[PDB]
Design an enzyme around this catalytic site. Structure first.
Site, PDB file in Angstrom:
ATOM      1  N   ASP A  25       2.811  -0.870 -10.752  1.00  0.00           N
ATOM      2  CA  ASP A  25       2.352   0.187  -9.840  1.00  0.00           C
ATOM      3  C   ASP A  25       3.424   1.263  -9.623  1.00  0.00           C
ATOM      4  OD1 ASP A  25       1.284   1.710  -7.855  1.00  0.00           O
ATOM      5  OD2 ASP A  25       0.954   0.052  -6.454  1.00  0.00           O
ATOM      6  N   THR A  26       3.308   2.384 -10.339  1.00  0.00           N
ATOM      7  CA  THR A  26       4.289   3.474 -10.247  1.00  0.00           C
ATOM      8  C   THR A  26       4.271   4.157  -8.882  1.00  0.00           C
ATOM      9  OG1 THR A  26       2.769   5.010 -11.304  1.00  0.00           O
ATOM     10  CG2 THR A  26       4.329   3.884 -12.735  1.00  0.00           C
ATOM     11  N   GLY A  27       3.193   3.936  -8.126  1.00  0.00           N
ATOM     12  CA  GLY A  27       3.075   4.513  -6.775  1.00  0.00           C
ATOM     13  C   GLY A  27       3.706   3.635  -5.706  1.00  0.00           C
TER      14      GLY A  27
HETATM   15  C1  LIG Z   1      -0.486   5.013  -1.648  1.00  0.00           C
HETATM   16  C2  LIG Z   1       0.768   4.767  -2.483  1.00  0.00           C
HETATM   17  C3  LIG Z   1       1.701   5.969  -2.431  1.00  0.00           C
HETATM   18  C4  LIG Z   1       1.502   3.482  -2.062  1.00  0.00           C
HETATM   19  N1  LIG Z   1       0.653   2.301  -2.355  1.00  0.00           N
HETATM   20  C5  LIG Z   1       0.735   1.917  -3.784  1.00  0.00           C
HETATM   21  C6  LIG Z   1      -0.607   2.153  -4.491  1.00  0.00           C
HETATM   22  O1  LIG Z   1      -0.453   2.036  -5.907  1.00  0.00           O
HETATM   23  C7  LIG Z   1      -1.710   1.202  -4.017  1.00  0.00           C
HETATM   24  C8  LIG Z   1      -1.637  -0.196  -4.644  1.00  0.00           C
HETATM   25  C9  LIG Z   1      -2.730  -1.023  -4.069  1.00  0.00           C
HETATM   26  C10 LIG Z   1      -3.718  -1.538  -4.905  1.00  0.00           C
HETATM   27  C11 LIG Z   1      -4.739  -2.282  -4.350  1.00  0.00           C
HETATM   28  C12 LIG Z   1      -4.788  -2.522  -2.986  1.00  0.00           C
HETATM   29  C13 LIG Z   1      -3.807  -2.000  -2.154  1.00  0.00           C
HETATM   30  C14 LIG Z   1      -2.773  -1.246  -2.692  1.00  0.00           C
HETATM   31  N2  LIG Z   1      -2.947   1.788  -4.504  1.00  0.00           N
HETATM   32  C15 LIG Z   1      -3.852   2.369  -3.716  1.00  0.00           C
HETATM   33  O2  LIG Z   1      -3.781   2.497  -2.489  1.00  0.00           O
HETATM   34  O3  LIG Z   1      -4.996   2.887  -4.420  1.00  0.00           O
HETATM   35  C16 LIG Z   1      -6.124   3.277  -3.655  1.00  0.00           C
HETATM   36  C17 LIG Z   1      -6.606   4.509  -4.392  1.00  0.00           C
HETATM   37  O4  LIG Z   1      -7.281   3.978  -5.534  1.00  0.00           O
HETATM   38  C18 LIG Z   1      -7.904   2.741  -5.165  1.00  0.00           C
HETATM   39  O5  LIG Z   1      -7.646   1.781  -6.183  1.00  0.00           O
HETATM   40  C19 LIG Z   1      -6.940   0.645  -5.658  1.00  0.00           C
HETATM   41  C20 LIG Z   1      -6.767   0.859  -4.159  1.00  0.00           C
HETATM   42  C21 LIG Z   1      -7.241   2.274  -3.881  1.00  0.00           C
HETATM   43  S1  LIG Z   1       0.966   1.039  -1.357  1.00  0.00           S
HETATM   44  O6  LIG Z   1       0.158  -0.074  -1.747  1.00  0.00           O
HETATM   45  O7  LIG Z   1       0.572   1.487  -0.066  1.00  0.00           O
HETATM   46  C22 LIG Z   1       2.495   0.578  -1.316  1.00  0.00           C
HETATM   47  C23 LIG Z   1       3.391   1.123  -0.391  1.00  0.00           C
HETATM   48  C24 LIG Z   1       4.720   0.709  -0.375  1.00  0.00           C
HETATM   49  C25 LIG Z   1       5.129  -0.259  -1.284  1.00  0.00           C
HETATM   50  N3  LIG Z   1       6.400  -0.684  -1.286  1.00  0.00           N
HETATM   51  C26 LIG Z   1       4.245  -0.814  -2.201  1.00  0.00           C
HETATM   52  C27 LIG Z   1       2.924  -0.395  -2.223  1.00  0.00           C
END
Ligand SMILES: CC(C)CN(C[C@@H](O)[C@H](Cc1ccccc1)NC(=O)O[C@H]1CO[C@H]2OCC[C@H]21)S(=O)(=O)c1ccc(N)cc1
Lengths: 99, 99
Positions: A25-27
């Site tokens: 997860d690059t995000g």
């Molecule tokens: C919003 C980002 C800048 C940060 N997020 C990482 C992100 O990749 C999450 C990773 C993720 C994946 C699944 C569930 C929760 C978080 N993905 C996500 O929120 O995607 C949403 C948009 O597309 C949809 O597809 C999947 C969830 C929806 S995060 O989960 O909140 C996060 C924040 C801080 C850390 N250290 C690790 C992860």
């Protein structure tokens, strides 16, 4: 390895004797797992994502086996719907975004 | 281009006349922006991340200019702390994870 993005980039990891799967997860700044028992000391931490904030335990210097590589890094343990391998681990994997 | 991951992989985008920045996010299925005004119809949608869920507007066939490429895809508009470019756009960029 090259990983295309047609599907979620899930990988198998081994951490402190435990087998898990997680999303590259690059995000994510940090590596985060929901159900992972880690040994030692930890500090309370709050991280923020899309739907609000979660309280996590920060464990440092955790061994992680991923992608034919062994790395050691910080793992946060707390409620997350999906385990995520963060940039902290990916830079160590020498992992880049290419196009 | 190759993007290393020592820092957040932020890129500049142009969408429907508006200039924004967003994170190239392999952990995001969908592309999501907070303060983007988009034209036309939309459907209500709920997405779930870390911390909980948010209500978003789903807009289809939105053109996006990103990384020297013009692409067209679905953009979700709603509360997010960070704008994210999801796999839906990255696959079109021919964007892969390499190590
Ligand atoms: C919003 C980002 C800048 C940060 N997020 C990482 C992100 O990749 C999450 C990773 C993720 C994946 C699944 C569930 C929760 C978080 N993905 C996500 O929120 O995607 C949403 C948009 O597309 C949809 O597809 C999947 C969830 C929806 S995060 O989960 O909140 C996060 C924040 C801080 C850390 N250290 C690790 C992860």
């Amino acid at each position: 390895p090259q990983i295309t993005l047609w599907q979620r980039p899930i990988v198998t990891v081994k951490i402190e004797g435990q087998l898990k799967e997680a999303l590259l997860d690059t995000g994510a700044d940090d590596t985060v797992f929901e159900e992972l028992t880690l040994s030692g000391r930890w500090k309370p931490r709050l991280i923020g994502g899309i739907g609000g904030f979660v309280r996590v335990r920060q464990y440092d210097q955790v061994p992680i086996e991923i992608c034919g590589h062994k790395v050691i890094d910080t793992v946060l343990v707390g409620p997350t719907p999906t385990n995520v391998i963060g940039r902290n681990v990916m830079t160590q994997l020498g992992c880049t975004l290419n196009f």
